Amino acid sequence: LNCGQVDSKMKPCLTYVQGGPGPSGECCNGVRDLHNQAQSSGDRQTVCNCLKGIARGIHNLNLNNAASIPSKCNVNVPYTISPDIDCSRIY
Numbered sequence: 867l868n869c870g871q872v873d874s875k876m877k878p879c880l881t882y883v884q885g886g887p888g889p890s891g892e893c894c895n896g897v898r899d900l901h902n903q904a905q906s907s908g909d910r911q912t913v914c915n916c917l918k919g920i921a922r923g924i925h926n927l928n929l930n931n932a933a934s935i936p937s938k939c940n941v942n943v944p945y946t947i948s949p950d951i952d953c954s955r956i957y
């Protein structure tokens with residue numbers, strides 16, 4: 867009960883970076899949302915670890931696309947933006 871939202875809100879964005887059925891629309895809002903939504907108990911810092919764990923092995927991390935999520939999805943948060951994302955460099 868912590869890394870559920872994770873997906874509920876960014877499924878289309880992780881799909882996007884590993885090469886699946888995203889980011890279309892649901893990602894940008896899911897994203898803008900998450901930036902502003904994952905501010906309950908620090909969620910994105912929890913998310914980080916969830917990301918890290920799948921990332922761990924994943925499919926085709928197109929980090930360029932990932933680092934392009936924010937620019938593409940008007941969510942302007944510095945959010946670390948990296949393969950094995952560290953929770954300590956998020957905002």
Ligand SMILES: CCCCCCCCCCCCCCCC(=O)SCCNC(=O)CCNC(=O)[C@H](O)C(C)(C)COP(=O)(O)OP(=O)(O)OC[C@H]1O[C@@H](n2cnc3c(N)ncnc32)[C@H](O)[C@@H]1OP(=O)(O)O
Nearest residue numbers: 867868869870872873876880900901913920932935936945
């Ligand atoms: C504000 C963000 C935007 C910043 C600016 C843009 C730049 C962003 C740059 C980084 C890009 C990537 C960002 C990712 C953000 C996310 O948080 S998306 C998370 C990573 N995505 C995935 O892992 C997608 C692939 N999905 C799975 O591996 C699996 O389907 C998941 C883990 C999503 C779970 O599936 P569900 O089946 O939907 O889970 P369920 O609804 O039953 O229940 C949730 C609960 O169960 C755990 N669970 C279930 N099944 C799994 C599997 N197979 N593996 C792991 N965990 C599983 C979930 O962890 C969750 O745990 P709770 O603690 O919430 O109970």
